[PDB]
Structures are given as structure tokens and as C-alpha cells.
Design a protein around this ligand. Structure first.
Ligand SMILES: Nc1nccc(-c2ccccc2)n1
Length: 155
């Protein structure tokens, strides 16, 4: 139990990607994919489907495994084991809530400066349909102290 399970879901269409602006709590003020903690009795993929609906209002059909990223925050005991998914098959339209504001971005207008800093490293892989394993050591939420990132054939 050194790490806690999380999901992160990117809705990636041929010309655009859906990102969410978190309004409070962890990650507030930044754009990111949609995700959160996997629950008891829930598969990781079912947790990803649930998080996407709760945070964006979208219903996902097929989810595709694209990556695994472990995050360490100095001073915090629990590692975040984030399972990253992508989908191009969604139903519904995005919903803004008290917690989250979704927005579509053209792929050449992705807001890297107002995202989690690790996204600048692995988004290029996601956009070219590559799979990856990563680890990022953070000091606070703005500084990457160390990282590793490698492309894989199997997530
Ligand atoms: N891009 C990024 N960077 C750091 C952390 C996260 C995160 C995502 C979902 C759930 C918990 C943490 N995402």
C-alpha cells in the first residue's frame, strides 16, 4: 500500500482534446484530464469511466489504456499511481459544475503553461498514440525535481 490508485482520462478526437479546469481542491487553477481515486470494489477502468462522467458529464464507450504515471510529492507519504486512458468515443456534451469547467482545445492550442508541468512531457506521446510509463517527483505542485518517462508496448 505504498501507492494509491487513480485514473486520468483524456478525450482525444482527431482535431481537439477535452480538458478540465479544476475549480477547487487538488490541482485547482490548472487544466488536466479528468480523474480521481479508484474506489473499493471498482476496476481501474470502471473508475476511469465514473470519473469522466462525474467531472465532465460525458459517457464513455471504449476506453483505451495509454499510460501509467507514478507521482511522488515530497513530504507526502502516499504515491499516486495514475492509470491514464484515452477515448475518442463519447456521448453527451461537456458539463460545467461547481468542481470542474471542461473546454475543448485545438491540438495546436493546448494550454501547457496552465497545466500540471508533467503534462508537457507525456502529452506529446499521447497525441502520437504512444503508450508510456512515467514517474515524477514533485516539490509542491509547480516544481518537478526528477522524472523518468519511457515509451512501452504494453501499459
Ligand atoms: N497531470 C497530473 N499531474 C499530477 C497529478 C495528476 C493527477 C491526476 C489524477 C488524479 C490525481 C493526480 N495529474
Amino acid at each position: 500500500g505504498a501507492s494509491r490508485l487513480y485514473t486520468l482520462v483524456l478525450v482525444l478526437q482527431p482535431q481537439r482534446v477535452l480538458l478540465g479546469m479544476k475549480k477547487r481542491g487538488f490541482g485547482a487553477g490548472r487544466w488536466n484530464g479528468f480523474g480521481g481515486k479508484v474506489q473499493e470494489g471498482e476496476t481501474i477502468e470502471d473508475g476511469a469511466r465514473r470519473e469522466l462522467q462525474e467531472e465532465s458529464g460525458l459517457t464513455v464507450d471504449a476506453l483505451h489504456k495509454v499510460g501509467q504515471i507514478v507521482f511522488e510529492f515530497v513530504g507526502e507519504p502516499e504515491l499516486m499511481d495514475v492509470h491514464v486512458f484515452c477515448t475518442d468515443s463519447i456521448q453527451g456534451t461537456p458539463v460545467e459544475s461547481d468542481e470542474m469547467r471542461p473546454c475543448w482545445f485545438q491540438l495546436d492550442q493546448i494550454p501547457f503553461k496552465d497545466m500540471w508541468p508533467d503534462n508537457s512531457y507525456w502529452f506529446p506521446l499521447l497525441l502520437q498514440k504512444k503508450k508510456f510509463h512515467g514517474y515524477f517527483k514533485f516539490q509542491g505542485q509547480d516544481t518537478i525535481l526528477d522524472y523518468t518517462l519511457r515509451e512501452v508496448d504494453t501499459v
